[PDB]
Design a binder for this molecule. Structure first.
Ligand SMILES: Nc1ncnc2c1ncn2[C@@H]1O[C@H](COP(=O)(O)OP(=O)(O)OP(=O)(O)OP(=O)(O)OP(=O)(O)OC[C@H]2O[C@@H](n3cnc4c(N)ncnc43)[C@H](O)[C@@H]2O)[C@@H](O)[C@H]1O
Ligand SMILES: [Mg+2]
Length: 215
């Protein structure tokens, strides 16, 4: 971020609007956005291939060690020195501990963890309208956050596309493993005294204003 550096984690249900908020956070605060789901889809599309692909499209978690490898690689290259926002990582307690080691080894620390509160029925409506620009990871919603022109990305004009993990059985998996494995991280970070909550059910601009109040 330079003068606007923060070291931020967003935790929230699959589908809660973290990558949408990361667009303003990257741009306003100059932070590196690390979505390990987008990082995995980029490791896939460049041919961590078919087995990771199936695991993601089933809605299950990829191995802790695989994702900790990809995050550590960003930190080791210097991508995060100007601040970062982690989105979808950590999502298990071994990943949180692995991250604490990575930060301990550089002497940096977390600024804030922001927990997006939203219920599972609204997440199903958020995912059902989603489409994505695959090269950039930008996301739109056909009802609540549409592209400016039909069917295409606002920046490149390239087509928007479906995500294969947005099928009904994987949405159920994603929500189930989130409540079992990821939700415990809210106490993990409240115990460190750095967790704040936002009402992710509100319209996207109102969620952005709540986030700005915390940053
Ligand atoms: N650490 C890790 N460990 C192990 N496995 C890992 C892992 N990280 C990744 N994985 C694996 O990879 C998979 C993919 O991970 P990932 O790509 O992170 O998927 P996810 O966890 O299911 O989360 P999403 O990306 O779907 O949600 P989001 O919070 O980014 O919401 P978005 O802004 O898109 O918004 C959704 C929709 O809502 C719209 N929207 C946003 N805000 C609003 C609003 N306020 N009102 C109405 N609509 C809204 C959006 O336009 C969009 O249509 C995981 O399921 C797992 O298999
Ligand atoms: Mg996302």
């Amino acid at each position: 971020g330079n003068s606007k550096k923060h070291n931020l984690i967003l935790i929230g249900a699959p589908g809660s609007g973290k990558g949408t908020q990361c667009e303003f956070i990257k741009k306003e605060y100059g932070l590196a956005h690390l979505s390990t789901g987008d990082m995995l889809r980029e490791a896939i599309k460049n041919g961590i291939g078919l087995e990771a692909k199936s695991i993601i499209e089933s809605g299950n978690f990829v191995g802790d060690e695989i994702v900790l490898g990809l995050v550590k690689e960003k930190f080791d290259l210097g991508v995060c020195v100007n601040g970062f926002v982690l989105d979808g990582f950590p999502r298990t307690i071994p990943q949180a501990e692995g991250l604490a080691k990575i930060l301990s080894e550089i002497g940096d620390s977390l600024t804030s963890v922001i927990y997006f509160e939203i219920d599972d029925s609204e997440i199903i409506e958020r995912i059902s309208g989603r489409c994505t620009h695959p090269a950039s990871g930008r996301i739109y919603h056909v009802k609540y956050n549409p592209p400016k022109q039909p069917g295409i990305d606002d920046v490149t004009g390239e087509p928007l596309v479906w995500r294969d993990d947005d099928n009904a059985e994987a949405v159920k998996v994603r929500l189930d493993v989130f409540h079992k494995q990821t939700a415990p991280l809210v106490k993990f970070y409240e115990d460190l005294g750095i967790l704040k909550r936002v009402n992710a059910k509100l319209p996207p601009k109102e969620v952005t204003e709540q986030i700005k109040k915390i940053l």
